[PDB]
Amino acid sequence: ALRWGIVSVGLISSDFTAVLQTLPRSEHQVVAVAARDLSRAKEFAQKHDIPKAYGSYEELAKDPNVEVAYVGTQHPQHKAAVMLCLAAGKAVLCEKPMGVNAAEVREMVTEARSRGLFLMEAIWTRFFPASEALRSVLAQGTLGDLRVARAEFGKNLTHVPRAVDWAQAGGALLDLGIYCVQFISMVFGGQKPEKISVMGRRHETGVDDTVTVLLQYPGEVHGSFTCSITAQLSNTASVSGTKGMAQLLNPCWCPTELVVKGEHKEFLLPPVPKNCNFDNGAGMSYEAKHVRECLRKGLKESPVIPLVESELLADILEEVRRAIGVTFPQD
Amino acid sequence: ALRWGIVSVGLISSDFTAVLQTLPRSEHQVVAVAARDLSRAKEFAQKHDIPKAYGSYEELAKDPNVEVAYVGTQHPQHKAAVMLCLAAGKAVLCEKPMGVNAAEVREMVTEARSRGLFLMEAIWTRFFPASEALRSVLAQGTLGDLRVARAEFGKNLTHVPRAVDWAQAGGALLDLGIYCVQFISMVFGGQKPEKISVMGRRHETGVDDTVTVLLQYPGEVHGSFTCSITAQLSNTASVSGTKGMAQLLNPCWCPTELVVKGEHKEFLLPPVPKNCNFDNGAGMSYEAKHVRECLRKGLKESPVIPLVESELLADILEEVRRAIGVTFPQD
Ligand SMILES: O=C(CO)CO
Ligand SMILES: O=C(CO)CO
């Protein structure tokens, strides 16, 4: 079995741990969990039936029974935790966005590469059967010659502290726009944009509120998206060519419905766990099973979200937030 | 009764004439129709039961029984027909877009104004009960403080000669984007944009193929739209604020469904005519009844689509097509 170590005991680590404990026991085992104090770690290990608890991430990195670390910390704490785990020879699945700016991602990627260790950014949406089916539709040429595509992700998250906080690098782009940028990149074959235009406005807590981006892609196609932590949007994503449109229905970030030229297709989520902190949390199973398949094949990154594309997504996101003057200490 | 004169006998004039002939006989009468030859005009007058036919527009302008002229010519022929009718003291309802560039619209508007004559651009969408209901939702503040809105209009019209022809000023912007620009202007109170960014690509017939625009509006709100004559899009339009979203469902340009914060509302079209050349053609009744209400009140333009806003819509459209190098002889 693939032996997992859980870094951080917040809500997302809770969901991911519950998912891993629904998978075949001969394929995945949760062997250890670290928190920034032993107390929190033991409470989590007892609730989730993990056999070892640590009060520092460093102790988890050093556990020789852990093969892969899941870094579920808040956004600004991803980098140090990843770097610790890689220095200790662990594979790492890092939560999204992998880092808060382009240089953090480059640093993590250079480290993983220099040590021949697997690293993947947990962009869970890419592994949903719906998303895989859209990629086939594109490979098959069903929509004809591409023209453009548009994604949107907006909800009123003003009462979700995580989400609006400057100190945790929250705001529309890093919480929600990350899903729009990855979708547009995916439909256009992970290609670097030729040009980006941005409009948006800030939120009174120090982060961005609502942001729309236009991206020129190579071969005369382009994408746009809108994200927001105050305004509710359609929360769909689409791609259109000369023969028609494919759409991933709301919830786009976690789609189970694909519509192609008016024809609907539903992809049910796994049955458990239910009651996950986050909508459709059960769908995290797909990325978990993907990491095991990569590691069994001896791969040092995923073909579905390669490290060079994580770097490009980071470059894009950083360019967008700089265009509207939203700077971070890290940069 | 309001006495109408029909200029041009194409498909749209066919639909508008059929609509007017379903209205109360004491309110609207179709008294005359002109075509560029008598033959075509008589055939149309016989099919549509109009009592007078002319083989030139000038003869219709001069008919003292005509009170209002409906100019249904192809795009580049709007200006000369409008100018002829206004010089002859007729009110004019001119089909969309009123002119092919900003100067044509300014010229028509200056002429109407200098003569104290009603002129309105036939932006039929604005008069649908659905659109009026969205304006109320906005006036009521139901969506909270505005944030942004997005419209799209795309279909494969490559086999519709009108639509792809350079000589008739076709293409995505003048055929379909005009609906997106008017919607965004309407939700943002007809205000002039502070900035416009554009990406798009040309079509091999000499006109634009697919075009996406980002528009900054005053008060930190913005809109975007995508239009295309090759790629099928969602064909919905939406506006979102801090308390939720309103959407006009497909067909946006001709909506009968409004969704506000998840609550659906349907507005049925008039029952006749049926079998109109254009989708939901029966809805042209609303703009026809509006022109009569303006004229009965002695108004020289519509408060719903004032001439200064037609000028601004034209200015926008022209700026967008220049940004992607699509120039016309007229400019
Ligand atoms: O990823 C998500 C957290 O907001 C979806 O809301
Ligand atoms: O106005 C319209 C003509 O395309 C709608 O298709």
Curated annotation (Swiss-Prot), chains A, B:
One GO term (biological process): D-xylose catabolic process
- Superkingdom is Eukaryota
Q: Which UniProt keywords apply?
A: NADP, Oxidoreductase
Quote the InterPro entries the UniProt record gives. Answer: Gfo/Idh/MocA-like_OxRdtase_N, Gfo/Idh/MocA_domain, GFO_IDH_MocA-like_dom, NAD(P)-bd_dom_sf
Its UniProt entry gives the catalysed reaction(s) as: (1R,2R)-1,2-dihydrobenzene-1,2-diol + NADP(+) = catechol + NADPH + H(+); D-xylose + NADP(+) = D-xylono-1,5-lactone + NADPH + H(+)
How changing residue 201 to A affects the protein? Answer: No effect on activity. Reduced activity and exhibits significant temperature sensitivity
Give the site residues for May play an important role in coenzyme binding.
70, 78, 96
What is an example of a Pfam family matching this protein? Answer: GFO_IDH_MocA_C3
Entry keyword annotation includes NADP: yes
Q: Name one GO molecular function term.
A: D-xylose 1-dehydrogenase (NADP+) activity
The protein's site described by May play an important role in catalytic activity is found at: 179
Distribution of this protein across tissues and organs: Kidney.
EC code: 1.3.1.20, 1.1.1.179
Q: Where is this site: May play an important role for the adaptation of the alcohol substrate into the binding site?
A: 175
For this chain, the family text in UniProt reads: Belongs to the Gfo/Idh/MocA family.
Q: What does the annotation say about its assembly with partners?
A: Homodimer.
Protein's name according to its UniProt entry? Trans-1,2-dihydrobenzene-1,2-diol dehydrogenase
What organism is listed for this UniProt entry? Macaca fascicularis (Crab-eating macaque)
